[PDB]
Amino acid sequence: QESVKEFLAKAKEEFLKKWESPSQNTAQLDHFDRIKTLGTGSFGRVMLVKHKETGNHYAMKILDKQKVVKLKQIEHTLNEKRILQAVNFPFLVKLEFSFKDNSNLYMVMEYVPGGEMFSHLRRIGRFSEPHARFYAAQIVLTFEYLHSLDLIYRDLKPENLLIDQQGYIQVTDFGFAKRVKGRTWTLCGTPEYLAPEIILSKGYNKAVDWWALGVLIYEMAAGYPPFFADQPIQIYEKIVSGKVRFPSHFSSDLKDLLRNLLQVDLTKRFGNLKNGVNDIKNHKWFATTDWIAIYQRKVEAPFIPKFKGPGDTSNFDDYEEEEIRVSINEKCGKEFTEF
Template sequence: MQALKERISSKLSEKTKSKDKEGSSSLKNSSPIDGKHSTTHDLHHHHHQTTSSSSSAVAGNIAGINVQSAEKVKAFLAKAKDEFQVKYDRPSQNTARPEDFDRIRTLGTGSFGRVMLVKHQASGNFYAMKILDKQKVVKLKQIEHTLNEKRILQAISFPFLVNLEYHFKDNSYLYMVLEFVPGGEMFSHLRKVGRFSEQHARFYAAQIVLTFEYLHYLDILYRDLKPENLLIDAEGYLKVTDFGFAKKIKGKTILKKETRKTFENKRL
């Protein structure tokens, strides 16, 4: 998590740092005016040479850092894909029971279920429990979406994605126990302020780009990006949630007519 936060910070401040270094290098290396022997032409020429050399040095350093960063990202994604595939191919079974949790209050409701704030009795930790009515899932023809969501969630692991902590079922319901993200939806915050500043927008966009880089490397299409599905944690970072429309694809896949129709309906 810390490495990703540093990567976001470096991306956002790279241009500023570059300009600062160029300016400070020029000031340090400039010669003081030396009476008759210093002319305006000499000073400009010297300043140009100093700025050019310091700019080249900064550019070289940045290029070296970028190469190292790219190699680390490549290694991280390769390892993440191997770990994901193992869990995806062998999905885990029931990892808890309904009676292991105390239900506190309802956080939200949907077409075929609700989300409740719960407390795990053994650990004392708070979670968001998604409770899905099996009959409604079948009636609304959401079986495939529900199974895809559970299978993907139990296999992924990334700082800007909501974690699936437990999952289980009984005769009437399916349960997915997710980490509780206290900041709520981005949509609520955006509605209050009207619009985010450029700095905030870039900060959030960087996290979304990194998240989708991870998902796409795993051949996962999310297909439901909107402010309502972006939660804000206690430190102000994003957590992408709701994988009901997510899909694992094989190789190069062209969008089907039904998928395009889904996007068009969402726009309307």
């Protein structure tokens, strides 16, 4: 419909203006109080912080420059910040500030207190099809938005989907997101969610996100992912094989959609055909979905996370609390000039 076409045209205009003139240096570390580590990885962490003047809470991602360099994530880190400061969509966590110092890079995001979908899914076991469908619809709209901007996301998994106070999804972690008009080649993403063409070291495209959506919908509705095995090499063998087993409790419509998203041949995969995303939106499994009402956040969510207020961390887990040290000397200044 022309209304969707004009929406996406405006979305791309607004993205490009910020893309071509990125914001930089919009806060500093001593404007915030550190509260609690919410997650950690090989080159950084995410911490709940509170702004000292406004009292607002944020999730601050802190990346160690020297580790980013050592683990060959420079371009990915520059992609992450440049994309986040340019996008705007109801189901994406919002970047509020960014800055750097002698040691670290900082991306200060809205704090979503309801926790990761991964926690809720593993607690309940599996989501009913209507519950899975509510979340899947949000990812479909989000990928329609990102792909129309020539952005591939490349990190879909339950850990990256935060549940907000209204029960809606907020996608976090743009560390693998990239502006790509055609193909791209980097090996990245978690093993269970990789498309076959990533595993086979091909030049791949945005069809890998639609494969990952198939994995996510399967895992939400089953409680475990479709290509599960003990070690990555065994997972990769199952992914490239072109066979899946569906639980008998899956509806026929759900199985049909999944066979079309988990299509090994990327030229036959839903989302990547002539009709693009509309083959997904018009599929029978989504017949009950009001796409506009989802976008407008007018649908009552299936699940509202339990939390006490905007500073509650009970839906996140516990990690060793480490210093945020800042060297007296500048590290890796050249590499991160544009940040």
